[model samples]
Target: MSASKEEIAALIVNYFSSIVEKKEISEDGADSLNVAMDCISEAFGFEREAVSGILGKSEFKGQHLADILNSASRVPESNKKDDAENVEINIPEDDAETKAKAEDLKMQGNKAMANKDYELAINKYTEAIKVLPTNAIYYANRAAAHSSLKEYDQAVKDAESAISIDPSYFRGYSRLGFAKYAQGKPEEALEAYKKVLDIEGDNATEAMKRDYESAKKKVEQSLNLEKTVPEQSRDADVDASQGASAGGLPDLGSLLGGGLGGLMNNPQLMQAAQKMMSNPGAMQNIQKMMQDPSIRQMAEGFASGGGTPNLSDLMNNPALRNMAGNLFGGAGAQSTDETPDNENKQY
Candidate 1:
């Protein structure tokens, strides 16, 4: 017979206790979160990396911060002694089926998310959370569910929770920044993404450095405008309507993580893209033919090959053509990482 849950848990606890304390591990060490992580993993007869991968969820570290801080007090005392590693790894005296149910629930949540049924996805993820409270992936997955629903604050909260349980987790940072950007908190979003630089083998960080710089410049431009606008003017403008601003900053975010990732190369193309993004009539038309999600995906593909579209091809759209001209003229166009400067310049 399989060990009861209690028996398995106790054995797992001992197995983990065999490891070094959290404080004893170097902060920079990849094994910093080895104790709880390894023990829990050993109980399931899996590699520590498997669970570490789960904890790496994008939003895991941003959830339920107070509870995490409280849990920290449970750290084992220095010089504590117990045969924790040698405890009989056997069937628990009180086994339960909650974990099985959690797995099932996770599957359901994944299905809901794929279908764009974000609200239903959240329900399934919540069920998983109840069944598997200690599983950081549940929190991370649920945070993604929240993000799909555009409940970014909640997504950030759950991501934080995942991080508190496993600080080495990378996904928590990814999700935290993605959700923060969705919630109109680009400053916080940028900081969250920066965490990738602190971890080892951060290829995403390496590749995105210039993108970060480009975004920082745009955000700086927006922030400067925000500051120059008087408090009274801001309030008055807000009274006129929600998100009303001159220069009509496009939805810098909200379409998808960090807004149409690298749309156009030239400032004119950039502004044209923004114009298309910000105008209600234009967006409505585009939405009629293709959803925002599809549009963004398409644009990203175009940019992937080259930052700018064929300059002559852009002649169809006068606004975009002007932007191409600015790029050829070499004024504000050379931006984004790994992308050539007006090279093979198109309309």
Candidate 2:
């Protein structure tokens, strides 16, 4: 049996939407979907446009995809804009009418956000920004959506853009601060939140003050942890002066290339090491770290004397583990197989 026009459109939608739901779509998915559609077109003797038109003229994502498909099923003819091209990439033209339309879209975005439909809120806010590009609220709203999605880089950029557009917008700084902190940048996050408190102080709500205090404490803890490294390195150096790692284990500082002292003294190398370590990618990140000359040198030097000890192994030794827990994130303090202190912390 031959599929009808609406049936074919739905088939295409399902094909693409399936990949989207799995979060696995890429060039391969697109290229394969194209082949599938082409085969369908050839079998049915329908033009490629007939299949592509469904996607070209319509938007589909998250909950909106259902709405789009329903409307497509209800009235498929209205979606036939295969040749329609949005040529001028919406160079935001601001006027009273545009502002009003943008405001309406912002309200829709707020409604979506209220329902916890973060992606839908992002789309609506993006539309509002296209209409009124100069508005900070639109960017701030989109930043919230990006943050909800855990796209911290985009959230940071949008928040910064919002702040640049309007310095007085406290929400931008607040979002920026949280996004930075989430990305393991306590120092920058501290600065951003401090700016928010400065801007909104006294006039700030109790909730706002509480937020500031919470962030302040978290940042201070992170800073204190950072400070402990060099102090521990000096202690480790003193231990090397007295003797060596018990059971012939290499000193912690030697593993880290002259230790945390050298790391603290060289901001550029410290930044590079942090960048390499912070990479969220798989073996690519590991390879990049290994490929770095300094890192490779350190690894080679550590491995040379047959004393390269695993961190877990070092911590397993009663004497070393106690100090390891203090030097690291309290791993030494934790005996047995237990989570770190802040593992379950909400913030």
Candidate 3:
């Protein structure tokens, strides 16, 4: 037969009060007792307060212990199983149908992005993410859509989630860096791009190196601008009525991060940019101009102090903005340790 509740309580009290003097328990004794109580409550069918109270009694209150005895019961086995090993990743692993469907959705999303339908791209990517929740590419693609829409906060969360799910994924960092830059977080953006370089390594492609260098220059320029922009003007809130120059500059960063050349390879884009400039309704034309691959290449050269484009020529137009802004903006190790003195290997 099982021991009586009174007897069980007595044994618990003795175990806890075992190595102590008086009615009080030692610090270690109390800690040991606490662990015992937790185990009994957690592993057995006993409730926590019932176990704590059982020991609390001898200062001899076991009679009252019976009062709180009917207070609780054990956790259900089904609930325990649910909390333990029953978790699911919620995506298919071996089904070709599911895989094909997700891939098709992503391709559709890419087409939407190229066509500049940001909303449709976001929707397609979201559907893909739902069907293939573990796919980091889906999250990164959605993040790019969000960036184009200027929903920076959403872009940031999606990019971070992709990186969290696949820590070494390169595109996640690329999207995260651009999204951070769009939100005016140059320091954070630079750190994100640095991770891109880390993943690419010393032999990073020319395009990768150019982006990394351009991003580095961007952060430095951003810091310099904040320091020199004067406290009084900084305090004054922008009057939107004054238009773009309300900030006292023509979005100089648009030039730094953009707008450096006259389309070396794509004349159509250059023509379109010129068309926009001719139209009175043009907005963000300079930024759009900067987006052309040719312009980006020139900007990269100018920032790196290579054969830069004519800065004075670029700065004179009203579209380019303040003279000083133009002036301010314009500007890898290998492995193998210790070789023979005359080895003549590629350094």
Candidate 4:
């Protein structure tokens, strides 16, 4: 017996949605995501599209495929186009009238921001949201306007709304943390920063780890200062001396090249970080360090120090340098041959 069209579509949807849920996992998990996408395409009877250029695109191709299938399912007698010869890329269309109204409000908000008119920007963003609440960018932009106006609480709420609507979008979480930090809620800010780490891969680095610690210390200090100083007399927002992370592992490059040179493509490193972060023993160790006053002070000192060492820099240590030989599962990280075939693999 053959499956009906409805049954096939339902199967494809369930399979693809599961892939979407688990796609953002570790290295092996990434491989699973790759296979899951392949399976979905096969299940939908699109082996040709899978073989064609569609599978070549990385990141969210599964979701895109599922979206395409869903679109086709809606249209009875849907006209088929050759994916290669005349592939129709069906983007989610905006309502023209709503888009225009949203754009006008966005522009007004931008103008208000430029002129330091916080109230006007707030109102404009509110108008934009009413017209186009589904667009995450609009909500984030409005959050920015509110933030500039020193409406930290409102800004945080808007950012949260943006993320709640689209959790996959990173900008919302990043902006949310900034807003919470501005509100003098260090723990909330910390939670936000940590959330970024959860979504972004291999987030701990000498720099990013320091960033996390610094943010933690600064928030702690801000709370301290708040208690010690009067509100009117206090000069808050003194968290100093650094930029915040995008909530991912530091680029392994500074020790080895800054952003994408090292850790970005290092599948081995991603697996390692996931393993370490998941170990209950490691978490317990981290918890103890976090709670210990002396350890926290020492950790904060390294974070505040300019000469802090990243994992790469640790190779310079005679002790660790010798140990590095056996670190890579009994051998050091091997330098793969820089051939076209090896390099051609996309992220």
Candidate 5:
């Protein structure tokens, strides 16, 4: 049978309140949990007092729902005994003789690493770890060897182990950063590098700073690309629509042949095209310029391939010159003359 909303709300309140009362979390965390409980109670239309009444029932007996669930899910004694039998505990070796043996193995690993035999280095480091699993250097060295072999996953694990054993171990964090960066996780890599710098403080090396800066730059670049891609595509779409609506001007460079083609290559003309496409007032000016009889004849001549139009002749037209001036000098150049027609209009 399904439980009612009151039963569910009581269970949740019991669970959350148990955590808060047990001090399992910090004060701020307990405050958030309290807020969550309030929200749940409000959502289910249940009273906080109902939780006590529900808990006092014989089935619950004032115990938390979480405690009841934990007891229900606990494995039986027989299975627990079998699991304990299969577990192998490795007690670390700390005697002088044992430490000497482990150090010898570590030196061998260092020699192998210097020889560029990463597999042999890994094996030697593994032997050292087996002899003395408590040494952070053994794990850090193994992590470096794993990274050298491009085994980034293993590198991360070994580096994490090194840091777990010795929190102040900066090399372990550096190796972790490299492995994460190689794995294309620059954000994770940046976190590791930040730890390395924090631990190193004033003793941080140039190489360490370089690694942190590069990872930071990679993260920033990726963030910027994510933010700008939509904007760039939107700008392209706007330019395409503006070109289509600019009075259906055919491809002018293709029509006007070499002279206009050369003019199209000019930076000033390209800038003018940018200005005209972005401003409706400039587009209106272009349409007005097209209506001039001389300019129309020149365009028709170019369209028909009747003759190669002279650039200077087109430039000499008073209307064409005025349009050019308006384009290059900004919108204010023609605003006094065009304001009556366009003042209240929105693009």
Candidate 6:
């Protein structure tokens, strides 16, 4: 049979108030529960003053709803074995003998790891964990063994267990970061490595610094790959570079209609040009390189049909080569070798 709305409301209010009194939830959670209780009271058309009167009845006897449920056997009992196991495992062993045994097991685990016997290493770490389950080092060592075996999911769990046992354990976060990075989750890896840095601070090792930097770069690259490229910006670069080249060499601009058309159409050259144009600093460098007397002489020779002036001479200029090397992609290096031959054929 269903209970009346007022009775239901009183039971809900009692449960919420009991949770707050036990301090099981945060202050914000308590505030949320109070709002829920208010809504319940409003729905049942009852005043807050009525709650005490209703809960104080002989049946409830001022007991919270959870207590009444326990008394009535309405709440299911937790597994006795699980509760016993939890209590047995979580309680830290303080005795000297237990600590020594655990430390010996850890040493054996380290030797196994050194020998590259990851399975043996895992077993030894597990024994150490059983001996001293609260030790963060045991879990972190086991995580490393699991990672060696490529069992990244288990590695992640062990690392998390280590962190839970001791939040300030930097190795646990490092292990977690490695596991995540191996699993192709660079964002999570980056976050875990950040925690490692925060914990280690001035004492962070070079290896840890490298791991954090690699993860950071991976995350940034993935983010850039996911971003939509701006078509407008690319077009602007293409236009600006074309204008600069044509303005700098008027005869070459006319020659573009005949022989140099194919050179201009080359996808690699166009791409390099676009890339160079996109960076204002590179553009300024290119303009400075163009103003060099030797380059101007070469351009004038080409304009006057003076034996297809060696483009390599212009490409070999240290400043231009450096700019091309920094600004362009794979094809930029070979362009110096290839472009001259292609230009000779067209001319």
Model 5, position 87, has a per-residue lDDT of: 16
Off by over 4 Å in 3: 1-97, 222-347
Worst 10 residues of 5 by lDDT: 259-268
lDDT of 2: 0.60
Per-candidate TM-scores read 0.34, 0.37, 0.37, 0.32, 0.37, 0.37
Residue by residue across 35-98, what tens digits does model 1's lDDT show? 5656565666656324333322312233423433222232333343542232233434123556
Residues 1-347, candidate 4: write the lDDT tens digits: 34345344444544454444433354456566557666666665655233323333322324545554432332244235532232124333456456667887877787887788877877888878877767777687678778877778888779877775677565676667778777766555665656556556584455444435635777566666565322221111432422344345465334322111122222334454544434334344545544656545433334222434467865565763454443323212222334424655588
Residue by residue across 123-186, what tens digits does model 6's lDDT show?
8888778777668898987898899798999998999778766776778888788887888877
Where is model 6 poorest over a 10-residue stretch in terms of lDDT?
259-268
Candidate 5 per-residue C-alpha lDDT over 117-164 given as tens digits, one digit per residue, 9 for 90 to 100 = 999999989978877766899998899899989799989899877866
Candidate 6 accuracy as lDDT: 0.65
Query: lDDT scores for all predictions?
Result: 0.53, 0.60, 0.59, 0.56, 0.66, 0.65
- lDDT ranking from best candidate downward: 5, 6, 2, 3, 4, 1
Looking at model 2, report the run of 10 residues with the lowest lDDT sum. 258-267
lDDT of candidate 3?
0.59
Residue-wise C-alpha lDDT for candidate 2, range 6-105, written one tens digit per residue? 5545556455544533334544456777677666666656564455555544454344456445324423232333432332444543464576778777
Q: Which stretches of candidate 4 lie over 4 Å from their true place?
A: 1-96, 107-116, 148-150, 202-214, 217-347
| lDDT (Cα, 0-100) at 117 in candidate 2 | 95
The segments of candidate 1 whose C-alpha lies over 4 angstroms from its true place after superposition are 1-95, 200-202, 205-347
What TM-score would candidate 3 get against the native?
0.37
Number of clashes found in candidate 3:
3
Task: Give the total clashing residue pairs for model 1.
Answer: 33
User: How well does model 4 score by local distance difference test?
Assistant: 0.56
